Swiss-Prot record:
Gene name, Swiss-Prot/TrEMBL: RNASE1
Protein name, as recorded: Ribonuclease pancreatic
Any single Gene Ontology cellular-component annotation: extracellular region
Recorded catalytic activity of this chain's protein: an [RNA] containing cytidine + H2O = an [RNA]-3'-cytidine-3'-phosphate + a 5'-hydroxy-ribonucleotide-3'-[RNA]; an [RNA] containing uridine + H2O = an [RNA]-3'-uridine-3'-phosphate + a 5'-hydroxy-ribonucleotide-3'-[RNA]
Range of the intact protein held here: 27 to 150 of 150
Disulfide bonds: 26-84, 40-95, 58-110, 65-72
Subcellular location as annotated: Secreted
GO MF entries: lyase activity; nucleic acid binding; ribonuclease A activity; RNA nuclease activity
Keywords: Disulfide bond, Endonuclease, Glycation, Glycoprotein, Hydrolase, Lyase, Nuclease, Secreted, Signal
BP GO annotations: defense response to Gram-positive bacterium
Length: 124
């Protein structure tokens, strides 16, 4: 089975581009990363940074996660991100998203040895 760490990479990492380049970015990526296979996910975030830089967040500022757990970490620096949010015309299996570019700090939850991101909590 896919590990939580691998799922984080599949769901959230896109080191191949520096920012979303068109309005279709989210539609294409949500489909290509198999995030719409069983249902339309309502929201997602992609991070346009190296994997190493995102993994390093697990050694940065420890903060509470939104749900109160205490294994969350906030990046010291802002990162290039893309927000994807389902539009009103989305209807499974033709899931449809609005693409929004942003530059924000990320907050991730970390687990394991090596201690790596497993969940994307928030951008701030």
């Amino acid at each position: 089975k896919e590990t939580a760490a691998a799922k984080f990479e599949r769901q959230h990492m896109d080191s191949s581009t520096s920012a979303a380049s068109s309005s279709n970015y989210c539609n294409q990526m949500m489909k290509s990363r198999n995030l719409t296979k069983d249902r339309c996910k309502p929201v997602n975030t992609f991070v346009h940074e190296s994997l190493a830089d995102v993994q390093a967040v697990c050694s940065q500022k420890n903060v509470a996660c939104k749900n109160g757990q205490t294994n969350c970490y906030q990046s010291y620096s802002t990162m290039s991100i893309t927000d994807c949010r389902e539009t009103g015309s989305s209807k499974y299996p033709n899931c449809a998203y609005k693409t929004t570019q942003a530059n924000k700090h990320i907050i991730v939850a970390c687990e394991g040895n090596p201690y790596v991101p497993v969940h994307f909590d928030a951008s701030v």
